[PDB]
Amino acid sequence: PTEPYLSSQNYGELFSNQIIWFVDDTNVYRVTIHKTFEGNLTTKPINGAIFIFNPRTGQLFLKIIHTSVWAGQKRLGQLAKWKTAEEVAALIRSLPVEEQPKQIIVTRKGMLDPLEVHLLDFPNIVIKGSELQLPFQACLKVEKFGDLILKATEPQMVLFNLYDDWLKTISSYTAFSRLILILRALHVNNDRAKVILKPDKTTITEPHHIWPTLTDEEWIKVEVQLKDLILADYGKKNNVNVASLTQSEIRDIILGM
Amino acid sequence: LAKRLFFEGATVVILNMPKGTEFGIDYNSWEVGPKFRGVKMIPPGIHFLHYSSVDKANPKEVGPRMGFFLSLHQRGLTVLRWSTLREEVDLSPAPESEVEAMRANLQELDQFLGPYPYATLKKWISLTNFISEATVEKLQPENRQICAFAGTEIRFSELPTQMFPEGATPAEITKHSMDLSYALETVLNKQFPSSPQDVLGELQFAFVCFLLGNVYEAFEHWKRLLNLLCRSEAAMMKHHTLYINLISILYHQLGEIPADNFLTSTLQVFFSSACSIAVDATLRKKAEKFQAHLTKKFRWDFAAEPEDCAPVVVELP
């Protein structure tokens, strides 16, 4: 029995002809700290989102998960996985046939079974996990996204494109690498990395864009810094801090081993 | 004491079994030769009889194990014969003329009969006390013999692959994929229309056929069936005594496993459902105790939610 998965050997398929979605369920069940009327600290759920992302076009489907779906429900943790799969399935159904995904890659293995069950009517879709640990969960540290989710009053599907206008000047592989670098940096530390994304006080991101408007050399500058921020976190975490192991060993770091 | 089993026990005699054959009942085994002609002092009830031929004439310490279930009676006498043609035991009924001569001879045959070791009875009962004649009659193969390696197929109840009713909406697909109670009831009503707890005998039957018959496909059925039961949360409210018995069945079954994952997950779900405030208090107190037992034994936290089920904790003002 074959058990496919995104790996370092095949990850070129992301940019190949076919249509591929990443699905991250990580941020659909979220809570915050909360004080009861009686003055005791507990948690309460806040809104979440499903991240559905096409790595070849940059296309993002951000399904906002409003807390009403939890109301009067038990074991939200388990239920979140099944809610995600319902929405991916509902999304696939609304798309015309030539737009449905050929492969769904999940960030978390708990999503394989619920997806398989809800996608039983789409027998040709590959549903598999990933050996690369891609930091898609940091998408809500992007304040445009975090705030739209936090304040949503109703379930909604909002479409974005994570590659802004890069695809006019760079390939999907380079575009993807740039996005994962930013996301991993935002995962390493939000604050240091948002600084690095504003090299200049006049550097502004467009209204319809996600990422700051930068020159070709500024982007080079920002990507060097984000690399150093990620690697300084690896060294400090794993206490094997060398510039010595980097012969495309960095490729393993940035993508997630 | 239990000396009364000399007079009141059952006796199984096997005729013309080749020297070196492996023969046994329940957890007990004997090597076969001219000085061994079966088993005496067997406690009445249902028992599992097994045997393996020699490998390839000269013993290589192997032979595919075969087995069959017998309902044995007080002062009963069973006469089994070896088939030279088939290299297996012939369960064909012995002529009652042949049986009566055999019983007239038990006094002299007693030197050649191994006493059933009473010290193993208590463990065998713990694994089979829910197996009835109805169970054996329903599950055993067409030709009644279970085999490690075609008329030998155990006749297990069909288990559903689809957990939800036909035409279910996405929300109903979700509800019935998380709570298998609808699925479990579809099996109960078809297999055991009037006595749902008969499922418990089928679960012991499967476990025995694996543990003592080395039939792997009965371990898989045991797994499927146990999964159907442990993830059927609503059902615990409905079939409450069924689940009280399942805990005791399971304590003895798992006591015979070394725990070489499928069980840790299904049992976590079971304990979540069985230990909630929702269920009958005696089920909850029993599930509580079994949980602590299982934790200490297997060094696992069956009372923990799975790690991948935690929410993101978001810092916000």
Residue numbers in the entry:
A (entry chain B): 1758 to 2014
B (entry chain A): 10 to 158, 202 to 312, 322 to 378
Paper text:
The U5-specific PRPF8 protein is one of the most conserved nuclear proteins and coordinates proteins, snRNAs and the pre-mRNA at the catalytic center of the spliceosome. U5 snRNP assembly in yeast requires binding of the the Aar2 protein to Prp8p as a placeholder to preclude premature assembly of the SNRNP200 helicase, but the role of the human AAR2 homolog has not yet been investigated in detail.
Here, we report the crystal structure of the human AAR2Δloop–PRPF8RH complex at 2.35 Å resolution. Despite the low sequence identity, the overall structure of human AAR2Δloop in the AAR2Δloop–PRPF8RH complex is very similar to that of yeast Aar2pΔloop in complex with the Prp8p RH and JM domains (Weber et al., 2013; Galej et al., 2013; root-mean-square deviation of 2.13 Å for 236 pairs from 330 AAR2 and 342 Aar2p Cα atoms). As previously observed for Aar2p, human AAR2Δloop exhibits an N-terminal domain (NTD; residues 10–158) mainly composed of β-strands, an α-helical C-terminal domain (CTD; residues 202–364) and a C-terminal, irregularly structured tail (residues 365–384). Despite the overall structural similarity of both individual components, the protein interfaces between yeast and human Prp8pRH/PRPF8RH and Aar2p/AAR2 are markedly different. Compared with yeast Aar2p, the AAR2 CTD harbors two extended helices (α11 and α12). In addition, Ile225 and Met230 are shifted by four residues (about one helical turn) along the α5 helix compared with the equivalent residues in yeast Aar2p, giving rise to a markedly different angle with which human AAR2Δloop contacts the PRPF8 RH domain compared with yeast Aar2pΔloop in the Aar2pΔloop–Prp8pRH–Prp8pJM complex.
